[PDB]
Design an enzyme around this catalytic site. Sequence first.
Site, PDB file in Angstrom:
ATOM      1  N   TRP A 279       0.844  -1.233   0.000  1.00  0.00           N
ATOM      2  CA  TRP A 279       0.000   0.000   0.000  1.00  0.00           C
ATOM      3  C   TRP A 279       0.863   1.261   0.000  1.00  0.00           C
ATOM      4  O   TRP A 279       1.845   1.326   0.774  1.00  0.00           O
ATOM      5  CB  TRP A 279      -0.937  -0.013   1.209  1.00  0.00           C
ATOM      6  CG  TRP A 279      -1.471   1.327   1.592  1.00  0.00           C
ATOM      7  CD1 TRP A 279      -0.799   2.343   2.196  1.00  0.00           C
ATOM      8  CD2 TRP A 279      -2.814   1.793   1.398  1.00  0.00           C
ATOM      9  NE1 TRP A 279      -1.620   3.413   2.392  1.00  0.00           N
ATOM     10  CE2 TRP A 279      -2.867   3.105   1.911  1.00  0.00           C
ATOM     11  CE3 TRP A 279      -3.966   1.225   0.844  1.00  0.00           C
ATOM     12  CZ2 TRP A 279      -4.035   3.860   1.893  1.00  0.00           C
ATOM     13  CZ3 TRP A 279      -5.123   1.972   0.827  1.00  0.00           C
ATOM     14  CH2 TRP A 279      -5.150   3.271   1.332  1.00  0.00           C
TER      15      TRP A 279
ATOM     16  N   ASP B 142       0.140   9.172   0.734  1.00  0.00           N
ATOM     17  CA  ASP B 142       0.703  10.532   0.526  1.00  0.00           C
ATOM     18  C   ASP B 142       2.173  10.478   0.103  1.00  0.00           C
ATOM     19  O   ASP B 142       2.999   9.869   0.780  1.00  0.00           O
ATOM     20  CB  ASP B 142       0.661  11.395   1.797  1.00  0.00           C
ATOM     21  CG  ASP B 142      -0.582  11.358   2.675  1.00  0.00           C
ATOM     22  OD1 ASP B 142      -1.609  10.733   2.289  1.00  0.00           O
ATOM     23  OD2 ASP B 142      -0.505  11.966   3.766  1.00  0.00           O
TER      24      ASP B 142
ATOM     25  N   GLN C  73       4.180   7.500   2.014  1.00  0.00           N
ATOM     26  CA  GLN C  73       3.447   6.700   3.021  1.00  0.00           C
ATOM     27  C   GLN C  73       3.305   5.282   2.457  1.00  0.00           C
ATOM     28  O   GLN C  73       2.751   5.113   1.364  1.00  0.00           O
ATOM     29  CB  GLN C  73       2.125   7.395   3.370  1.00  0.00           C
ATOM     30  CG  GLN C  73       2.286   8.704   4.138  1.00  0.00           C
ATOM     31  CD  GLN C  73       2.844   8.513   5.526  1.00  0.00           C
ATOM     32  OE1 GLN C  73       4.058   8.505   5.749  1.00  0.00           O
ATOM     33  NE2 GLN C  73       1.950   8.343   6.483  1.00  0.00           N
TER      34      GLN C  73
ATOM     35  N   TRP D 135      -4.240   0.161   4.353  1.00  0.00           N
ATOM     36  CA  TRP D 135      -3.429   0.999   5.272  1.00  0.00           C
ATOM     37  C   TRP D 135      -3.008   0.165   6.485  1.00  0.00           C
ATOM     38  O   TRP D 135      -3.727  -0.767   6.861  1.00  0.00           O
ATOM     39  CB  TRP D 135      -4.187   2.262   5.689  1.00  0.00           C
ATOM     40  CG  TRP D 135      -3.333   3.250   6.418  1.00  0.00           C
ATOM     41  CD1 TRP D 135      -2.545   4.216   5.863  1.00  0.00           C
ATOM     42  CD2 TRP D 135      -3.164   3.358   7.842  1.00  0.00           C
ATOM     43  NE1 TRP D 135      -1.920   4.938   6.837  1.00  0.00           N
ATOM     44  CE2 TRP D 135      -2.274   4.431   8.061  1.00  0.00           C
ATOM     45  CE3 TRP D 135      -3.695   2.677   8.944  1.00  0.00           C
ATOM     46  CZ2 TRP D 135      -1.902   4.830   9.342  1.00  0.00           C
ATOM     47  CZ3 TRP D 135      -3.321   3.068  10.211  1.00  0.00           C
ATOM     48  CH2 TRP D 135      -2.433   4.127  10.403  1.00  0.00           C
TER      49      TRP D 135
ATOM     50  N   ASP E 265       2.249  16.344   9.221  1.00  0.00           N
ATOM     51  CA  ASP E 265       2.514  16.575   7.787  1.00  0.00           C
ATOM     52  C   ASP E 265       3.323  17.857   7.636  1.00  0.00           C
ATOM     53  O   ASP E 265       2.970  18.750   6.871  1.00  0.00           O
ATOM     54  CB  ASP E 265       1.206  16.601   6.988  1.00  0.00           C
ATOM     55  CG  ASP E 265       0.230  15.474   7.301  1.00  0.00           C
ATOM     56  OD1 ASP E 265       0.661  14.450   7.841  1.00  0.00           O
ATOM     57  OD2 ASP E 265      -0.967  15.625   6.967  1.00  0.00           O
TER      58      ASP E 265
END
Length: 464
Positions: free
Chosen positions: A36, A39, A55, A63, A157
């Site tokens: 997976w 971002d 990510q 996720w 972030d």
Amino acid sequence: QNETAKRELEEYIADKKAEINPRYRPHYHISPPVGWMNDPNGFSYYKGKFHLFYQFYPYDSVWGPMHWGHVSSSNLIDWEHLPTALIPETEMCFSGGAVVHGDDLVLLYTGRVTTDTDPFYNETQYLAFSNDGVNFRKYEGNPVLSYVPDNSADFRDPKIWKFKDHWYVVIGSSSNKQGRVLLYRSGDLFNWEFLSVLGESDGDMGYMWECPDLFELGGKTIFLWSPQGLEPKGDRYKNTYQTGYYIGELDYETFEFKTDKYFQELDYGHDFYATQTIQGDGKTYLIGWFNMWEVPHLEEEDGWAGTTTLVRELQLIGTRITMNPLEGIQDLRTDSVHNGDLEPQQAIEFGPTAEIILQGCLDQKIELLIQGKEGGLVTTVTWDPEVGKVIVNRSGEVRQVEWVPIGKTSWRLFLDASSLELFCGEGEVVFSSRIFSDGDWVVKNSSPQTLSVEAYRLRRSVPA
């Protein structure tokens, strides 16, 4: 680095790679080698190459505990995989940025750790250094930045840049269920001073502000970010979550971002979220995650999920950020498939890849029907002159917008094994949508008019 954790991951990736169904794997968009991706992270330029992280959950096509995947490129088109840059420990390696200080590529990323109080997580900012572009070691005294106003559990972030004698960072947060972005600065990367709440939802702009960004374009400050919690409004904000911008001016003496808070979506497609940018040679480059939270991922059962978008060049034309493919994407072109008239009901056959430059009369309907050679799910791209809208109908789900051409009236369309990017005109109207069908792409002219069409197949530029 923990050598056991590292090697165990390298060989898990190496083994699992032959179990990946190739049918939807992109030829010329970055995909994870297995499992997976979300971002993109830490877009940077270091010892003669562009670096991108992302990510990454290696172990499934959904996720999970967050790692940073890692690729590099000389030309922002061809990309090679590197070993995984960050592995979770007490902290999950959530999104962040990168800057080059001296000999070192520096990562600034959010560490999310578990707690036993109602939030059940807290987020702080962690550093990691590489001196070779491959191996990344975490700073012994992480986190370096913990202070968040109103002690919000959301604090993630970071996007870091240098301006004169300070590194600046914008970071996503929330307060009282209102999204906001925070600005800090540092003389040394380790000690961070809170400067201001750069923006905050007045009630209509969502409960959380992810993947913030701030940069100069056409003499203005762009604030670009991924708000969560906007309600759909007519044709706009229909995706689970949005990516868009304000236009304004950051005052580096008062730390105020002066703006009218006029929000625009960057990309009108089904599957665009969470961006990175970098600037060099007077250009501004952007890339996004080519998927969407909380909606089906048709590639998931094939043992992987997610790609990046093409890299786009940005410009500010009047009030609109335009996106165009790189000046040299033309290097992907193999076979010339079509040139000149494409009559009503006439079709062009490709492999898994296509570039199509088309022009029609905007006084008449334009419509392409995109489907696999063996049939299956359809995507239509439509110009309806009666309402003045470009319409992308992806297997029944509509994204549409009013189009006022800046200049050129041609469209440039990129298909990959499971993706569509439509660039209208000079890039003022762009749709990025994941598309799935049975076999090599067939594009049919459904228009009541003949189109002018220049079309190519495109070579691979990324691993399998």
